[PDB]
């Protein structure tokens, strides 16, 4: 007994994991059975009691079509549930990969970052900010160097909006988070290299007031670190977006294009 | 769509009965097909145009469904064709507040209190659901008549710019962490500008461009609007507390909902 979702099918045995509102299964196309997919089941009533904008996630995933961004193939709406048929990444999340390997060579990090950067180029050209990049949201797919990286979870994402009645905080806050992803990529690279994030805290509100009071300094870069990787981390991990490396510097950064 | 008539679920409309357009939607006066005395607004939204925009119709629909109040424009139905999406909404036979002000110039404090009582009732609902409109303005405030000024009923519309307040994210950018709730009081400013325009006949703060008004506010830690000398103490207190550049210093919702001006 397989459950059918449009031209795809899955077994309830083949559970991958959960979201807050979604269950995810390993599935396949019904004719092209070698084609593996992830199928997210999302209860419509639970979702309508949340602040989740699935419409937005779907709109953004459709707009993106890139080998380093998790593919959405299909959306099926039943009266109870919504089903997302997506690319299956057979390597899990980067979080679990780091748990397994500890730290990564600069060679490995360059490979991962080249791919992340390729994804970011697409995001940037469409004016989309992810805002929630983290190892749990970076998925891994193996071929048979062999690892391909895929950005996932556009739940927190937003479009850059590139008025006498509008609140001054709103006018003035345009583009405030335009460089957010560059910080995130920084923290992720940092963790890859060093083996913990640059900035930990006991709670969400503890990290808020840390950043709010600039009780936040450049973190410890190991003395092993190559000049280019160190330059990159320093320019990404700037508390003020005013002072943070911008996208064009990042895409074309020396660290990304060598031996 | 050669023909003059279109069917939209249980509703229908004639293309002759055009009300107007926004950026993405064309809006018609329609009716229920059986209960033909029931007038509705039918918004037609081209799906290809919409897919080239940053408009989140899914969000607008989710928010309209969640809201159910006499001072918030009602959503009755959503129909999807391969070309178009149709919203069947409450028809407001009075147009927008912008056109009402164009017609009347300025409004008595009595009139403003009636309008503001209703707007405030809508805000109470938004606030209790943790929704910020962010785009309140006379063009987005619609008017509905029975058969008169107390005869007028107000309906907030256009949740296009609206958003939900999200009540160790080690990986998250500090600007994002720190910017939570930054715009929590935005609608209070907006309602201030709208009241101000109702009273005086212009917005409190005009400029040469959008970026000129940004740098005016940016480099003026507290600005004071010109309150006409005739203005009652309560209305003046209200405007001054709403029109604070810094959300830190701006009247909060509980002061606003229970403000002396609203019960007098
Ligand atoms: C943010 N990541 C998700 O969307 C996601 C989260 C939980 C479960 C599945 C998820 O979606 C997805 N998950 C995969 N591959 C995958 C595969 C795993 O094991 C081999 C795995 O380890 C349990 C894993 O951890 C989450 C993910 N691929 C595509 C999507 Br689309
Ligand atoms: C917030 N404005 C809109 O969504 C809107 C804009 C253009 C056309 C219709 C619009 O939606 C709506 N418009 C009405 N009633 C209405 C009626 C008008 O004349 C009698 C009118 O003047 C042309 C008007 O335009 C400002 C609105 N009701 C519900 C919706 Br839902």
**CATH number of domain containing A100:** 1.10.510.10
Which of A69, A92, A115 delimits the end of a domain?
A: A92
What is the β-pairing status of strands A3-5 and A8-18? antiparallel
- Contact between residue A179 and residue B173 where contact means Cβ atoms under 8 Å apart: yes
- Contact between residue B142 and residue B157 where contact means Cβ atoms under 8 Å apart: yes
Burial of B166 (0-12, 13-18, 19+ CB in 10 A): exposed
B179 at interface of A, judged by CB pairs closer than 8 A: yes
Number of structural domains chain B divides into: 2
Same domain, yes or no: A70 and A119: no
Give every CB contact of residue B128 below 8 A, 6+ residues apart in sequence.
none
Give domain status of residue B217, yes or no: yes
Q: Strand, coil or helix: what is B54?
A: coil
Same domain, yes or no: A139 and A177: yes
Instruction: Report, in angstroms and rounded to the nearest whole number, the Rg of chain B calculated over CA atoms.
Output: 20
CA–centroid distance, residue A170 to ligand 2 (Å): 26
Same domain, yes or no: A120 and A232: yes
Residue in the block written with tokens 């229908």 = B12
Same domain, yes or no: A162 and A236: yes
Positive or negative, the Cα torsion across B242, B243, B244, B248?
positive
Which chain B residue has the Cα nearest residue A179? B173
Rounded-to-integer distance, Cα A32 and Cα A88, Å: 14
Q: How far is CA A98 from CA A92, A103, A146, in A?
A: 11, 7, 16
Nearest residue to A86 via CA among A151, A21, A31 = A151
A72 membership: H or E segment, kind and range = strand A72-77
Same domain, yes or no: B46 and B127: no
Rounded-to-integer distance, Cα A227 and Cα B60, Å: 49
Rounded-to-integer distance, Cα B217 and Cα A61, Å: 37
Give domain status of residue B60, yes or no: yes
Among the partner-chain residues A56, A170, A197, the one whose CB lies closest to the CB of B56 is A56
Same domain, yes or no: B188 and B100: yes
Widest CA span in chain B: 59
* Beta-bridge partners for B233: none
Same domain, yes or no: B111 and B80: no
Same domain, yes or no: A111 and A233: yes
Give every CB contact of residue B249 below 8 A, 6+ residues apart in sequence.
B222
Ligand 2 in reach of B158 Cβ (< 6 A): yes
Q: How far is B20 from chain A (nearest CA, A)?
A: 21
Q: Do A197 and B58 touch (CB under 8 A)?
A: no
Nearest residue to B186 via CA among B255, B112, B143, B127 = B127
Give domain status of residue B1, yes or no: no
Same domain, yes or no: B121 and B239: yes
Q: How far is CA A59 from CA A7, A54, A72, A120, in A?
A: 21, 8, 10, 17
- Contact between residue B30 and residue B13 where contact means Cβ atoms under 8 Å apart: yes
Q: How far is A1 from chain B (nearest CA, A)?
A: 33
Same domain, yes or no: A137 and A235: yes
Give domain status of residue B57, yes or no: yes
* Beta-bridge partners for A26: A38
Residue in the block written with tokens 């449009």 = A6
Structure tokens at B121: 């009732």
Question: DSSP secondary structure string, B61-93?
Answer: HHHHHH---TTB--EEEEEE-SSEEEEEEE--T
Which of A62, A92, A122 delimits the end of a domain?
A: A92
Q: Any alpha helices (H) in B184-229, and if so which ranges?
A: 186-200, 210-218
Q: What angle do CA A10, A13, A14 make, to 5 degrees?
A: 60
DSSP B203: -
Give every CB contact of residue B151 below 8 A, 6+ residues apart in sequence.
B145
Positive or negative, the Cα torsion across A68, A69, A70, A74?
negative
Mutational test site, ligand 2, from B92, B99, B156, max ligand atoms within 8 Å of CB: B92
Same domain, yes or no: B90 and B102: no
Give every CB contact of residue A120 below 8 A, 6+ residues apart in sequence.
A181, A185, A247, A250, A251
Give domain status of residue B105, yes or no: yes
Give the number of other Cβ atoms within 10 Å of residue A18's Cβ.
Answer: 10
Rounded-to-integer distance, Cα B33 and Cα B6, Å: 11
* Structure determined via: X-ray
Same domain, yes or no: B182 and B222: yes
Nearest residue to A175 via CA among A160, A194, A158, A154 = A160
* Ligand 2 atom 24, closest CA: B95
* Beta-bridge partners for B96: B142
Give domain status of residue B151, yes or no: yes
Domain range spanning residue A55? 3-92
Nearest residue to A76 via CA among A66, A68, A86 = A86
Rounded-to-integer distance, Cα B33 and Cα B9, Å: 9
- Contact between residue B250 and residue B241 where contact means Cβ atoms under 8 Å apart: yes
Which of B38, B73, B95 delimits the end of a domain?
A: B95
Nearest residue to A108 via CA among A181, A189, A183 = A189
- Contact between residue B15 and residue B37 where contact means Cβ atoms under 8 Å apart: no
């Amino acid at each position: 007994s397989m459950e059918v979702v449009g031209d795809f099918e899955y077994s309830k045995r083949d559970l991958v994991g959960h979201g807050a509102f979604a269950v995810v299964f390993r599935g396949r196309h019904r004719q092209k059975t070698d084609w593996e997919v992830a199928i997210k089941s999302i209860n419509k009533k639970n979702l309508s009691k949340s602040q989740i904008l699935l419409g937005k996630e779907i709109k953004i995933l459709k707009e993106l079509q890139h080998e380093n961004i998790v593919a959405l193939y299909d959306v099926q709406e039943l009266p109870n549930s919504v089903f997302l048929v997506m690319e299956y990444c057979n390597g899990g999340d980067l979080a679990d990969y780091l748990q397994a390997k500890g730290t990564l060579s600069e060679d490995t990090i360059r490979v991962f970052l080249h791919q992340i950067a390729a994804a970011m180029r697409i995001l940037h050209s469409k004016g989309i900010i992810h805002r929630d990049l983290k190892p749990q949201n970076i998925l891994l797919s193996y071929a048979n160097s062999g690892i391909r990286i895929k950005i996932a979870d556009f739940g927190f994402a937003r479009y850059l909006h590139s008025p006498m009645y509008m609140a001054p905080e709103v006018i003035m806050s345009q583009h405030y988070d335009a460089k957010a992803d560059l910080w995130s990529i920084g923290t992720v690279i940092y963790q890859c290299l060093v083996g913990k994030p640059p900035f930990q805290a006991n709670s969400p509100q503890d990290l808020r007031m840390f950043y709010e009071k600039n009780r936040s300094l450049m973190p410890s870069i190991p003395r092993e670190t190559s000049p280019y990787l160190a330059n990159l981390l320093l320019g990404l991990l700037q508390r003020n977006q005013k002072d943070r490396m911008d996208f064009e510097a990042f895409f074309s950064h020396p660290f990304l294009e060598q031996g």
